[PDB]
Amino acid sequence: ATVLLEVPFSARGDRIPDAVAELRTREPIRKVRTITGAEAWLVSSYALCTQVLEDRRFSMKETAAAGAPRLNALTVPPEVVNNMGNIADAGLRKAVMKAITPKAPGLEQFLRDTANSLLDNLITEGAPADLRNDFADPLATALHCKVLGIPQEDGPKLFRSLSIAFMSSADPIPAAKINWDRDIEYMAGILENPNITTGLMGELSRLRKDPAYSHVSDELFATIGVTFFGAGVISTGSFLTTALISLIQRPQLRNLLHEKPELIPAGVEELLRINLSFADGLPRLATADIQVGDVLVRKGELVLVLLEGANFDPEHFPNPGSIELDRPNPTSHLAFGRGQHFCPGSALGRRHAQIGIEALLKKMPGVDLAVPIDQLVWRTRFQRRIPERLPVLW
Ligand code: HEM
Ligand SMILES: NC(=O)c1cc(Cl)ccc1N
User: If DSSP states are collapsed to H, E and C, what string results for the chain?
Assistant: First the structure.
């Protein structure tokens, strides 16, 4: 006899388990068990992932309901799961999004300079270098500090909350509350800080004093800075790191982008499509009985949308395991989600990786793993799959 199939299948972000294809072919929606012991539906075909993400009756908000089947424990106050709905209601949606485009003046030059300088330093210290801790993460952290308008020097302390903040835990994490509360006081201080006038926090400080926002709470303003810092640094640093590994593992692809750097955008778009950085399916709670393939999902039940199920579905991406820079549907992957909660930092996520890859390829054209790929240590019980250290030589 066997327990119900458990998720996640594997912390490894350098290979998709064979089980995913088997599941997608035989059972594109099946019952699994999460780390909390709750039952959920795993959706692993493009068509069904797309359906669940586009049907708002599969609610993100409701996952936070007391007594709901859970993927993992909340690392935030329950009202913060409705973050984007709260931002929408307070009239802050247009302002938040305009503040987080890679289109801001001199932001790209900032990324480029920062990536180059992180890289010059690696080269000066000599190989082996750690591309996660000493390149991709400081790059992400530096980008979000610039973007928020906060001092660069504050980034590493805020960054160190993230190994806890993005845990995927069966149980509540005392440390997450500590960090959350601390980082919220930090962001509040920043709203009251007369020198913080640029980026997202500079803008939020203005709107805060505007009579049109007089009834928006201080908690929400601080929450926006903590959440956008955390979600963004975690997501871009994780993505970049594992996209480097895929790049490294493909010297032919790396050559091509080195010769023809104008293909880098088309490359990152494939790197996003194939990325395994999201460790768990996207959770949603059925607010009604909804047919999904052969299964009638009952109101109250948890549904997990498996992003690599969609992104490696051969019915939508032929030869899905393969990076092809000339697919006719290149950006239709679900790497940023789909429908109501589509990632608001997608343009920023894209530029960060394009530039980080671009600079890496110029400075380190012979970049290569300095250990066998199996030696990478994968972070467990975490909402991203990342190698703890990315040791490389060049
Ligand atoms: C390449 C980097 C990134 C990847 C792969 C990525 C992935 C995603 C995905 C798949 C979702 C949808 C989650 C869901 O529907 O449950 C999402 C939502 C979100 N992301 Fe991004 N993301 C990235 C960069 C960013 C950046 C740069 C920011 C902002 C600085 C950001 C902040 C958010 C926030 C606040 C949400 C919630 C959207 C909502 O609830 O309506 N992430 N991220
Ligand atoms: N800074 C934090 O501790 C934190 C950040 C996010 Cl984005 C989510 C949960 C957290 N505890």
Answer: CCCCCECCCCCCCCCCCHHHHHHHHHCCEEEEECCCCCEEEEECCHHHHHHHHHCCCEECHHHHCCCCCCCCCCCCCHHHCCHHHHHHHCCCHHHHHHHCCCCCCCHHHHHHHHHHHHHHHHHHHCCCEECHHHHHHHHHHHHHHHHHCCCHHHHHHHHCCHHHHCECCCCCCHHHHHHHHHHHHHHHHHHCCCCCCCHHHHHHHHHHHCHHHCCCCHHHHHHHHHHHHHHHHHHHHHHHHHHHHHHHCCHHHHHHHHHCHHHHHHHHHHHHHCCCCECCCEEEEECCCEEECCEEECCCCEEEECHHHHHCCCCCCCCCCCCCCCCCCCCCCCCCCCHHHCCCCHHHHHHHHHHHHHHHHHHCCCCEECCCHHHCCECCCECECCECCCEEEC
Which residues surround ligand 1 with Cβ inside 6 Å? 60, 83-84, 100, 227-228, 231-232, 235-236, 239, 282, 335-337, 341, 343-345, 348-349
CB-based contacts of 125: which residues, under 8 Å, 6+ apart?
none
User: At how many Å resolution was this determined?
Assistant: 2.5
Atom of ligand 2 nearest to the CA of 229: 7
For residue 360 the two structure tokens come to: 């890496």
Ligand 1: which of 239, 270, 343 to mutate, most ligand atoms within 8 Å of CB? Answer: 343
Neighbours of 252 (CB within 10 A): 8
Into how many domains does the chain fold?
1
CA dihedral over 145, 151, 157, 158, signed as positive or negative:
negative
137-148 and 107-125 helices, crossing angle to 10°: 150
Ligand nearest to the CA of 166: 2
CATH number at residue 176: 1.10.630.10
In sequence order, the 6+-apart residues with CB closer than 8 A to the CB of 21 are: 312
- Please give the Cα distance from 246 to 48 (Å, whole number): 27
Query: Which residue range is the domain that position 36 belongs to?
Result: 1-394
Which residues, other chains included, contact 367 with Cβ-Cβ below 8 Å and sequence gap of 6+? 248, 254, 360, 361, 392, 393, 394
